[PDB]
Symmetry: C2
Subunit: 209 residues, 2 copies
Amino acid sequence: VLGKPQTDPTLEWFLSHCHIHKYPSKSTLIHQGEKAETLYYIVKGSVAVLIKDEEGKEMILSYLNQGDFIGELGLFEEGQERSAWVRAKTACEVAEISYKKFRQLIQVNPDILMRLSAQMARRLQVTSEKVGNLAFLDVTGRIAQTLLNLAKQPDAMTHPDGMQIKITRQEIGQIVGCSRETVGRILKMLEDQNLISAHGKTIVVYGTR
Amino acid sequence: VLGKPQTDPTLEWFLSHCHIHKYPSKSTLIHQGEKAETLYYIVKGSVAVLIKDEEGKEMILSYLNQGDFIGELGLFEEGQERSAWVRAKTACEVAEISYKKFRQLIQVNPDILMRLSAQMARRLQVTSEKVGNLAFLDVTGRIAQTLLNLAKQPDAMTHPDGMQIKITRQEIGQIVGCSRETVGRILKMLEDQNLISAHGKTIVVYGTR
């Protein structure tokens, strides 16, 4: 896309081959058992990659950025039955098309599929160092821990009194390992400003906390 | 490799380009902070892929087969600093070479690196459904659970009285989530034949259990 420091001709060769334009979030696309025969290039917006366990827990394990890939876990993974990896996290705009036609532009350029591969591989790098993290039930300091982590990502939204990032305690179920319950204590104190200040579900770390 | 039903002329084009020949196991190659600039194609033998957490726990999270890849997590992941993924699990024979020259045979054929990619992606599929599994502290029935799982893999070794698979309870720390201690009860009962029969560290599910 233009207007931003990208400088990716090949992608503009890809985005002219797909369909950019998504929807506001909640729009999960494939993680219930649907053959992932369609790919979605999150070009703007960002989502919450989530997986299924051996006992059916489909929790969020990863998330993307404005310019990542979606459904690779079905076209590239070799899944062909959802395999799990997507649920909208923002109103995005994905360059979504079918990997029958795409696979053949990814085959016309030995850097296109290689560009996508590395994304997932980075997720391997994200899943290889945070598996037993939330599993540790470390909730003590592991909640606000991620909230300040949001202050370090493109999501910290400045506002005339603080810079927030709305995170339902549902993300926190996942990231911390405990439901919105133990973490419900904490996320409850947030609006109490006893730890933060959640302006609704938007959480504004004022400054001191 | 010849003698076995493989039928992979492209690999024989690749294995004639590398170095197959490993060692008995314990031979970890890259999982401590070594730039994974070298790749190892496990051609025979199989290893125990392990990862580092956010608190330094570097536990086995995956394992291979006789004909998988190693160090992909460094050459293809784009790691370039170990990133974690290997520790010998058997005396293997890896076709190990350096990804400078390899990358250029894998670049000579668009099915070679793609063949490897899918392997890792399959590991994505292995890590996307067993993250919170061992994290569940399900040890009740989650130990023998995997021991019988070994009876379903190429490892079940027939013997004139039972068919085993040696598994230190160390694997069980990982797979079940508890140190060989809770599982130490269990693995202790195994030699007692109160649950199994471990002929040393080799475990023989006789038949009834």
